[PDB]
Write an enzyme that holds these catalytic residues in place. Sequence first.
Site, mmCIF file in Angstrom:
data_model
loop_
_atom_site.group_PDB
_atom_site.id
_atom_site.type_symbol
_atom_site.label_atom_id
_atom_site.label_comp_id
_atom_site.label_asym_id
_atom_site.label_seq_id
_atom_site.Cartn_x
_atom_site.Cartn_y
_atom_site.Cartn_z
ATOM 1 N N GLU A 35 -15.143 -36.070 42.877
ATOM 2 C CA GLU A 35 -15.580 -36.824 41.664
ATOM 3 C C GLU A 35 -15.522 -38.305 41.595
ATOM 4 O O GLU A 35 -16.418 -38.844 41.351
ATOM 5 C CB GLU A 35 -14.617 -36.326 40.170
ATOM 6 C CG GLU A 35 -14.996 -34.668 39.810
ATOM 7 C CD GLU A 35 -16.318 -34.825 39.081
ATOM 8 O OE1 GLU A 35 -17.046 -35.934 38.916
ATOM 9 O OE2 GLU A 35 -16.779 -33.659 38.858
ATOM 10 N N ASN A 46 -24.285 -41.995 32.722
ATOM 11 C CA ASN A 46 -25.149 -40.722 32.723
ATOM 12 C C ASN A 46 -26.422 -41.378 32.028
ATOM 13 O O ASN A 46 -26.446 -42.158 31.179
ATOM 14 C CB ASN A 46 -24.482 -39.303 32.031
ATOM 15 C CG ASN A 46 -23.439 -39.210 32.827
ATOM 16 O OD1 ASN A 46 -22.203 -38.978 32.500
ATOM 17 N ND2 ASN A 46 -23.627 -38.911 34.078
ATOM 18 N N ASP A 48 -27.896 -39.808 29.595
ATOM 19 C CA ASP A 48 -27.772 -39.721 28.246
ATOM 20 C C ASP A 48 -26.886 -40.764 27.522
ATOM 21 O O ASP A 48 -26.539 -41.229 26.161
ATOM 22 C CB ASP A 48 -27.216 -38.248 27.772
ATOM 23 C CG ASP A 48 -25.505 -38.353 27.734
ATOM 24 O OD1 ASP A 48 -24.761 -39.341 28.231
ATOM 25 O OD2 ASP A 48 -25.024 -37.374 27.649
ATOM 26 N N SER A 50 -23.923 -41.742 28.138
ATOM 27 C CA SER A 50 -22.366 -41.663 28.076
ATOM 28 C C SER A 50 -21.995 -42.193 29.630
ATOM 29 O O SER A 50 -22.722 -42.251 30.552
ATOM 30 C CB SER A 50 -21.987 -40.342 27.937
ATOM 31 O OG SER A 50 -22.355 -39.315 28.964
ATOM 32 N N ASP A 52 -18.637 -41.630 32.734
ATOM 33 C CA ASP A 52 -17.608 -40.814 33.327
ATOM 34 C C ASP A 52 -16.583 -41.922 33.861
ATOM 35 O O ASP A 52 -17.131 -42.956 34.351
ATOM 36 C CB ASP A 52 -18.190 -40.091 34.311
ATOM 37 C CG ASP A 52 -19.169 -39.022 33.981
ATOM 38 O OD1 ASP A 52 -19.007 -38.500 32.824
ATOM 39 O OD2 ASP A 52 -20.120 -38.633 34.617
ATOM 40 N N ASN A 59 -15.678 -37.646 30.568
ATOM 41 C CA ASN A 59 -16.758 -38.049 30.087
ATOM 42 C C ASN A 59 -16.688 -38.777 28.578
ATOM 43 O O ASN A 59 -16.037 -37.944 27.810
ATOM 44 C CB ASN A 59 -17.860 -37.140 30.038
ATOM 45 C CG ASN A 59 -19.301 -37.551 29.554
ATOM 46 O OD1 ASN A 59 -19.767 -37.221 28.449
ATOM 47 N ND2 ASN A 59 -20.179 -38.120 30.184
ATOM 48 N N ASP A 101 -10.311 -25.744 27.261
ATOM 49 C CA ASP A 101 -11.579 -25.814 26.494
ATOM 50 C C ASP A 101 -12.501 -24.557 26.490
ATOM 51 O O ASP A 101 -13.412 -24.405 25.747
ATOM 52 C CB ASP A 101 -12.420 -27.049 26.747
ATOM 53 C CG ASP A 101 -13.824 -27.174 26.253
ATOM 54 O OD1 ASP A 101 -14.113 -27.474 24.858
ATOM 55 O OD2 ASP A 101 -14.671 -26.891 27.019
#
Length: 129
Positions: A35, A46, A48, A50, A52, A59, A101
């Site tokens: 990662e 990203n 979108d 957002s 990381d 995120n 989650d």
Amino acid sequence: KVFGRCELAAAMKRHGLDNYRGYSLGNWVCAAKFESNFNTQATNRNTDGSTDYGILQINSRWWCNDGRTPGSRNLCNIPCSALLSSDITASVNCAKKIVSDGNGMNAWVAWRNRCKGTDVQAWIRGCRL
Ligand SMILES: [Cl-]
Ligand code: NA
């Protein structure tokens, strides 16, 4: 900070990740390798909008506040910059919530693509743990 392999594994183990929700230590180290390359300061934007953050590339749409991701929730209740610290405590606390989650470690695209179903013990071989 750029962690060494063993060094990171020891810090993760000390913060309760070994076998957390059934994922052995190899998994978390492998996910960090792919990662962030073990770098706490890694950020990736990203499409979108957002971003990381950190060693586990957590995120900003759901997990942390960075003040530039519209309509985002701050499920771990921290500023995202806290995720870039030398001290992995906050990344590890937030990861434990992400991994509970319902999706497990499939939340991390590099784990799913590069660690999942591989021999993950190797990421913890030769380390004094
Ligand atoms: Cl799970
Ligand atoms: Na957020």
